[PDB]
């Protein structure tokens, strides 16, 4: 904390990618404030996932020493290494934020999860030579981008929206109209304030290819309609990295918490300052791979990364967490 201003977490081992995600969610400041507001006074000390996330966030905000996650792993039942390796980061993040969102219902901080992370997309199937079109509106909290044969995020987004032909052997079952030539596609209606992009490093053959992501990411061309008052310019907030072995390896996260190009490497207990280039360019890959990226929308940056004070944690919660620290010591 003395060098960088920020504390790290206790070592991974079986934990894998949780520490990387916890720092990412902790430095989503608007979420952190909302997490502190959850009415967890009635909750069980051990079994409550909402309370266990308040504990980590509290300790990341106040501790000089590294913060433990053992109370938190016991709460949502992922104790073994197998339980992390079977899942991916978006599934873990979904498990934490569902608990948080459910606890926030009927409270002053309701709807903070969908405000921060929920975007909307339309999937469509249009028949070419017949008048039939199926549409589904879908909420998403995260996007999984393809990287095999893609130079960069721009190209992955182009491929994400690209129109697929349903011709020949793979014609579209159109019900009363029978098999038809058709065009399948997806289109983004809105992009959230905090954008979670996972990069598909497994097709399970692994992909160590060089994949380039920028500091500033404009996404207006991937929307159906563009607001001129609020363009879809996104700014790079976090880069989650894996090195070494599969079914194992070492997980790190790079972060610029204030959103001001001032980057730090979060290597469990060791938080240290780094260059933009160590955080961005040097995690592109080729012959160490980035696997998740977090972008924040430029128009939403002040609100998402709003300053936290110790006053933002309710007195009842502070007293309860210090009662644990006294009794356990
Ligand atoms: C071993 C390993 C290496 C790398 Cl470099 C990234 C991940 C990783 C960690 C967390 N989250 C994601 C999300 C990803 C994107 N992705 C999907 O969602 C479906 C297919 C895929 O690629 S890769 C990854 C990883 O660990 C993984 C855990 N479970 C499977 C691996 F063992």
Are 127 and 208 part of one and the same domain? no
* Header resolution in angstroms: 2.7
Determine the Cα–Cα distance for residues 106 and 92; give it in Å rounded to an integer: 24
Q: How far is CA 84 from the centre of its chain?
A: 16
126: tokens are 């249009």
H helices of the chain, in order, are: 18-26, 29-36, 49-62, 70-75, 81-85, 89-103, 112-117, 153-161, 276-279, 301-304, 315-328
Are 150 and 289 part of one and the same domain? yes
Are 183 and 218 part of one and the same domain? no
**Residue whose token pair is 């987004």:** 157
149-154: long-range pairs with CB below 8 Å, 24+: 150/211, 151/211, 151/212, 152/211, 152/212, 152/213, 152/214, 153/197, 153/212, 153/213, 153/214, 153/217, 153/293
C-alpha dist (Å) from residue 257 to 28, 263, 306: 8, 8, 11
In 3D space, the residue among 14, 293, 299, 23 whose CA is nearest the CA of residue 156 turns out to be 293
Domain-located, residue 108: yes
303: tokens are 């609100």
The residue whose CA is least distant from atom 13 of ligand 1 is: 88
Are 84 and 133 part of one and the same domain? no
Kindly give the number of the ligand 1 atom that is closest to the alpha carbon of 202. 22
Determine the Cα–Cα distance for residues 327 and 329; give it in Å rounded to an integer: 5
C-alpha dist (Å) from residue 213 to 122, 248, 290: 25, 25, 10
197, β-bridge pairs: 143, 293
Residues with CB under 6 A from ligand 1: 17, 85, 88-89, 144, 198, 200-202, 242, 246, 249, 289, 291
Kindly give the number of the ligand 1 atom that is closest to the alpha carbon of 289. 5
Are 212 and 170 part of one and the same domain? no
62 catalytic per annotation: no
Determine the Cα–Cα distance for residues 6 and 9; give it in Å rounded to an integer: 10
Q: How far is CA 130 from the centre of its chain?
A: 41
Separation of CA 79 and ligand 1 centre (Å): 18
Structural domain span for residue 33: 8-118+299-329
**Residue whose token pair is 């990226």:** 293
**Residue whose token pair is 């209606």:** 189
Q: Which of these is catalytic: 62, 87, 250, 282?
A: 250
CATH number at residue 136: 2.20.210.10
Residues constituting the chain: 329
250 catalytic per annotation: yes
Query: How many domains in the chain?
Result: 3
The residue whose CA is least distant from atom 18 of ligand 1 is: 88
Domain-located, residue 3: no
* Backbone conformation region of residue 101, classed left if phi is above 0, alpha if psi is from -120 to 50, else beta: alpha
In 3D space, the residue among 118, 265, 291 whose CA is nearest the CA of residue 200 turns out to be 291
Determine the Cα–Cα distance for residues 37 and 22; give it in Å rounded to an integer: 18
327: tokens are 């009794």
Are 96 and 18 part of one and the same domain? yes
Are 132 and 48 part of one and the same domain? no
User: CB within 8 A of 91, min separation 6: which ones?
Assistant: none
Burial status of residue 316 (CB atoms within 10 A of its CB: 0-12, 13-18, 19 or more) = exposed
Separation of CA 202 and ligand 1 centre (Å): 7
Are 204 and 156 part of one and the same domain? yes
Determine the Cα–Cα distance for residues 283 and 294; give it in Å rounded to an integer: 14
In 3D space, the residue among 326, 314, 327, 329 whose CA is nearest the CA of residue 51 turns out to be 314
Method: X-ray
Treating both helix axes as pointing N-terminal to C-terminal, what angle do 18-26 and 89-103 enclose, rounded to 10 degrees?
50
The residue whose CA is least distant from atom 2 of ligand 1 is: 246
296: tokens are 């924040």
Contact 255, 24 (CB under 8 A): yes
Separation of CA 246 and ligand 1 centre (Å): 9
DSSP letter at 278? H
Strands 233-243 and 250-255, sheet pairing: antiparallel
User: If you write DSSP's letter for every residue of 196-261 in order, what string do you get?
Assistant: EEEEE-B---B-----B--SEEE-GGGBSS--SSS--EEEEEEEEEEES-SSS-EEEEEE-TTSSS
Are 237 and 328 part of one and the same domain? no
């Amino acid at each position: 904390k003395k060098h960088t201003g920020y504390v790290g977490l206790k070592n991974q081992g079986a934990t894998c990618y949780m520490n990387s995600l916890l720092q990412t969610l902790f430095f989503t400041n608007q979420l952190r404030k909302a997490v502190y507001m959850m009415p967890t006074e009635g909750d069980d000390s051990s079994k409550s996932v909402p309370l266990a996330l308040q504990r980590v966030f509290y300790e990341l905000q106040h501790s000089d020493k590294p913060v433990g996650t053992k109370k938190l792993t016991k709460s949502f039942g992922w104790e073994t290494l197998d339980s992390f390796m079977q899942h991916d980061v978006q599934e873990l993040c979904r498990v934490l934020l569902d608990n948080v969102e459910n606890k926030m219902k009927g409270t002053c901080v309701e709807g903070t999860i969908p405000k921060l992370f929920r975007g909307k997309m339309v999937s469509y199937i249009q028949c070419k030579e017949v008048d039939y079109r199926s549409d589904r509106r879908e909420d998403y909290y995260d996007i999984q981008l393809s990287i095999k044969g893609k130079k960069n995020i721009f190209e992955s987004f182009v491929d994400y929206v690209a129109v697929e032909q349903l011709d020949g052997d793979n014609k579209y079952d159109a019900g009363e109209h029978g098999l038809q030539e058709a065009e399948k596609g997806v289109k983004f209606l809105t992009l959230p304030p905090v954008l979670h992009l996972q990069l598909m490093r497994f097709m399970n053959i692994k992909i160590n290819d060089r994949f380039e992501f920028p500091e500033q990411l404009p996404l207006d061309e991937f929307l159906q309609k563009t607001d001129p008052k609020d363009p879809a310019n996104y700014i790079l907030h976090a880069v989650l990295v894996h090195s070494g072995d599969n079914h194992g390896g070492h997980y790190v996260v790079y972060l610029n918490p204030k959103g001001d190009g001032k980057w730090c490497k979060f290597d469990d207990d060791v938080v240290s300052r780094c260059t933009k280039e160590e955080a961005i360019e040097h995690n592109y890959g080729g012959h160490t791979n980035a696997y998740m990226l977090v972008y924040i929308r430029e128009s939403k940056l002040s609100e998402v990364l709003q300053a936290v004070t110790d006053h933002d944690i309710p007195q009842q919660l502070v007293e309860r967490l210090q009662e644990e620290k006294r009794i356990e010591a």
